């Protein structure tokens, strides 16, 4: 059941990493960071939807209860457990369950919300890639879960 006291404590600790006065507010830039630190799973465009209620150019400020209000609705949304398999199904090399490294560069750096260079490095080191290559998506979903 929602909102036993200890839930609010755990979520407020994660927020208290980012506030540097103790006034209960953060910059809008770190809203995605606190949310994903707790393992909540929104898109960039889904964060942008909320930020249009509060920010003049992407450099504003936002209270703990505003963040927690967005989180309260996102905590009833689905875990994407079916959705991530439907996504990876598209990028299989031959239908045996294995994503190609070539397609994966287009998935990282061209399609959708993309990834920046120094965190594409992270996925290359996670996958042990020194040339042409591949990865099983059921295993990779299990690892990202």
């Amino acid at each position: 059941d929602q909102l036993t006291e200890e839930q609010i404590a755990e979520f407020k600790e994660a927020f208290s990493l980012f506030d540097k006065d103790g006034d209960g507010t953060i910059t809008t830039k770190e809203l995605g960071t606190v949310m994903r630190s707790l393992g909540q799973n929104p898109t960039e465009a889904e964060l942008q939807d909320m930020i249009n209620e509060v920010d003049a150019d992407g450099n504003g400020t936002i209270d703990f209860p505003e963040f927690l209000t967005m989180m309260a609705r996102k905590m009833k949304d689905t875990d994407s457990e079916e959705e991530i398999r439907e996504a990876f199904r598209v990028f299989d090399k031959d239908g045996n369950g294995y994503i190609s490294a070539a397609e994966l560069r287009h998935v990282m750096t061209n399609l959708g919300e993309k990834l920046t260079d120094e965190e594409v490095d992270e996925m290359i080191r996670e996958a042990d890639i020194d040339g042409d290559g591949q990865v099983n998506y059921e295993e990779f979903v299990q690892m990202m879960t």
Partner: protein, 48 residues
């Protein structure tokens, strides 16, 4: 749909690392503060 999940994974991981590291550093510091009080008390007591 993949890009949301990877953004979640790496931030959640770096949060776990920093929270664990923080707890380790707090634990080592409370270790030091205990050892300093012990060293002071012991010297005072043996001096008497």
């Amino acid at each position: 749909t993949i890009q949301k999940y990877w953004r979640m994974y790496v931030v959640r991981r770096r949060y776990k690392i920093r929270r664990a590291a923080t707890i380790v550093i707090q634990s080592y510091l409370r270790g030091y503060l205990t050892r300093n009080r012990y060293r002071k008390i012991l010297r005072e007591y043996k001096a008497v």
